[PDB]
């Protein structure tokens, strides 16, 4: 047939430089930063808990819930119990925030609380201050907006107006109320906030709140839960999460798991590779996921990312919302979250726990070594499944914050960074997503690593990020991230594909950012480039030429180290290269070489005229692309030596005459763009 002649013919002038326009890409208003970096400085643990003295409201049961930060207060005699509970409650907050002043107040007077709150203001001064208020000892807070504390003699419950409390506490603050009708405290706080603004024109924005119960409801009295239920969720999630697991009908299908076993789960909440740490690590991933798939982006940032302690509280608050539901409570929050109790990622936790403590009698009796959870593996699998088909802009992948959690270990880091590449792949939108979920500082920290398997995968990510967000050049130079990439570009054995990206990364770092130009210079980048300049991969020659191109833009020191390495000499080979793009880059670089000088005598002038003479034999060049860049290079030369071209121009109405002749052939050009811009430069002389 007459089809084989057809398919086997070169289609001339049908490529990216021809069909697409030679333009930049209009980069978006990239709003992924948290420049609002809050820090919780100090903590009040006001803790009204007059032990063995049940207030007149709640007549308590015989087997009631008598636990209170994992202590029976009645077993110890009153004063020991109260001191101890302050110690435990402090220890529980120390997990989530170990660098804060913890000033605990135990059965406090009104005046005591005033001293305390105002003192913590003057310490923290602009930054966020926790105010935990327990209130099991005192009667339930009133419709008046008064919460109860004591008098000096312990006879009378004195009231304490919420208006007074938010006077003493500052505006950047956060309240945790664990007392029976705590919704009433939330409401009244928001009312007395409005009252301030209305009276001011003759707080609330900055105040966060967390409250155990709605204004109607009473907290549970159920013998096997602790009385501290909302606090315990908020600040010992895994401990009640496991105990609450054990109380369900779910345990029907995990036989040989009693509460005694859960007392002795081996491990800790930091060592990831031990059953307790594992569950903790999972938990974190899950709650962070439920937040990221439910809340609107702005709000998610405000709570779950801004500062540690608040983020830890809201993560754990999701667990409280799920538990306390099953005992007719509903917790309340000042930035009001949506209902997350039904969200399907909880049934993942349920299974994850199930596996991870059906495996527990075999551990704790025999001494069977701990087998890790399939959770993170399977969860990465789902993310992989989504990447296959889902290049779409449909519902984004549910597992995205779980991928972030997996980067934090060895175990699954290689698999995750590949999948993160294969995601950041898909476009600029996907990079916008992963920067929102907060991938950036964790990826940036992996540059400080030296595991040789990461070198292709980080390079690959950093490429894709710095395409989208050029302003990240700030961050990479601060941490000596540049040195990581300098070493990848120095390696002859890393494949050409990735060395290309590395060169590109170094171009972005160096691009008109003076400190980045300084750093990469003194990391010997000129020597590294010129070794790789004459490769068999045309992207690499292009980009490595652009590096040299950017590094000596308006930066005279780079020109000096260039002349000592004969950089300009070596770059002349790329001027007669078989790809236009390589020639463009070569021309670009030899131009921006010329562009800076600070008026130097022999060598600068002699070299410049040699460069110009070599660029002057690119008039007979096919691609107008090269000729545009060629006019730009000459424009840089024109901008320095204006006195000479003024004389040479005003004559006609050796060297400089030839450059002017070139600019005429470029002005009188068949392609429009070239003729336009050549005429602009020649009009600047005119």
């Amino acid at each position: 047939e007459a089809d084989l002649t057809d398919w086997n013919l070169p289609l001339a002038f049908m490529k990216k430089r021809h069909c697409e326009k030679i333009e930049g890409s209009k980069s978006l208003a990239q709003s992924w930063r948290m420049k609002d970096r809050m820090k919780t400085v100090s903590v009040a643990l006001v803790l009204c808990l007059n032990v063995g003295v049940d207030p007149p409201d709640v007549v308590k049961t015989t087997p009631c819930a008598r636990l209170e930060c994992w202590i029976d207060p009645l077993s110890m005699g009153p004063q020991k119990a109260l001191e101890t509970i302050g110690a435990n409650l402090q220890k529980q907050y120390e997990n989530w925030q170990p660098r804060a002043r913890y000033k605990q107040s135990l059965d406090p007077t009104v005046d005591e609380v005033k001293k305390l709150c105002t003192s913590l203001r003057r310490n923290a001064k602009e930054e966020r201050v926790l105010f935990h208020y327990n209130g099991h000892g005192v009667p339930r807070p009133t419709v008046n907006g008064e919460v109860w504390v004591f008098n000096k003699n312990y006879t009378q419950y004195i009231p304490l107006s919420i208006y007074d409390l938010q006077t003493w506490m500052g505006s950047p603050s956060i309240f945790v109320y664990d007392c029976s009708n705590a919704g009433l405290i939330v409401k009244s706080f928001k009312q007395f906030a409005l009252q301030r603004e209305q009276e001011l024109e003759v707080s609330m924005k900055n105040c966060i709140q967390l409250a155990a119960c709605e204004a109607t409801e009473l907290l549970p009295m159920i013998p096997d839960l602790p009385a501290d239920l909302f606090t315990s969720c908020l600040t010992t999630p895994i401990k009640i999460a496991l105990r609450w697991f054990c109380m369900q009908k779910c345990v029907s299908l995990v036989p040989g798991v009693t509460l005694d076993l859960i007392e002795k789960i081996p491990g800790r909440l930091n060592d990831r590779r031990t059953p307790l740490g594992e569950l903790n690590w999972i938990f974190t991933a899950i709650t962070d996921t439920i937040a990221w798939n439910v809340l609107p982006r702005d709000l998610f940032q405000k709570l779950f990312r801004q500062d540690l302690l608040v983020a830890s509280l809201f993560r754990n608050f999701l667990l409280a919302e799920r538990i306390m539901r099953s005992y007719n409570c509903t917790p309340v929050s000042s930035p009001r979250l949506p209902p997350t109790y039904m969200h399907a990622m909880w049934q993942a936790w349920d299974l994850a726990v199930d596996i991870c403590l059906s495996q527990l009698p075999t551990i704790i009796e025999e001494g069977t070594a701990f087998r890790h959870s399939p959770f993170f593996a399977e969860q990465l699998t789902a993310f992989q499944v989504w990447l296959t088909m889902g290049v779409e802009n449909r519902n984004p992948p549910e597992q995205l914050p779980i991928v972030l959690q997996v980067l934090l270990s060895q175990v699954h880091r290689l698999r995750a960074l590949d999948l993160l590449g294969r995601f950041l792949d898909l476009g600029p939108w996907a990079v916008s997503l992963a920067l929102s979920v907060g991938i950036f500082p964790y990826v940036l920290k992996l540059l400080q690593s030296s595991a040789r398997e990461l070198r292709p995968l980080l390079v690959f990510i950093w490429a894709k990020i710095l395409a989208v967000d050029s302003s990240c050049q700030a961050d990479l130079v601060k941490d000596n991230g540049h040195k990581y990439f300098l070493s990848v570009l120095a390696d002859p054995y890393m494949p050409a594909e990735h060395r290309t990206m590395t060169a590109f990364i170094l171009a972005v770092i160096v691009n008109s950012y003076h400190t980045g130009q300084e750093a990469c210079l003194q990391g010997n980048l000129i020597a590294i480039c010129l070794e790789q300049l004459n490769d068999p991969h045309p992207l690499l020659r292009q980009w490595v030429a652009i590096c040299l191109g950017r590094i000596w833009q308006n930066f005279d020191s780079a020109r000096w180290c260039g002349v000592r390495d004969s950089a300009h000499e070596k770059l002349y080979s790329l001027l007669s290269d078989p790809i236009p793009e390589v020639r463009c880059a070569a021309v670009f670089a030899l131009g921006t070489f010329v562009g800076n000088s600070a008026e130097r005598t022999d060598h600068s002038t002699t070299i410049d005229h040699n460069v110009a003479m070599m660029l002057a034999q690119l008039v007979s060049d096919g691609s107008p692309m090269v000729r545009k860049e060629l006019v730009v290079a000459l424009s840089h030369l024109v901008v320095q030596y204006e006195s000479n071209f003024c004389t040479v121009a005003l004559q006609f109405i050796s060297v400089y005459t030839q450059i002017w002749r070139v600019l005429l052939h470029l002005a009188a050009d068949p392609y429009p763009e070239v003729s336009d811009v050549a005429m602009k430069v020649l009009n600047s002389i005119a």
């Binding site: 990312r305 959690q405 934090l408 920290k445």
Partner: peptide
């Protein structure tokens, strides 16, 4: 001072 703990 990153939010989660990175064990490099």
């Amino acid at each position: 001072e990153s939010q989660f703990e990175m064990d490099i």
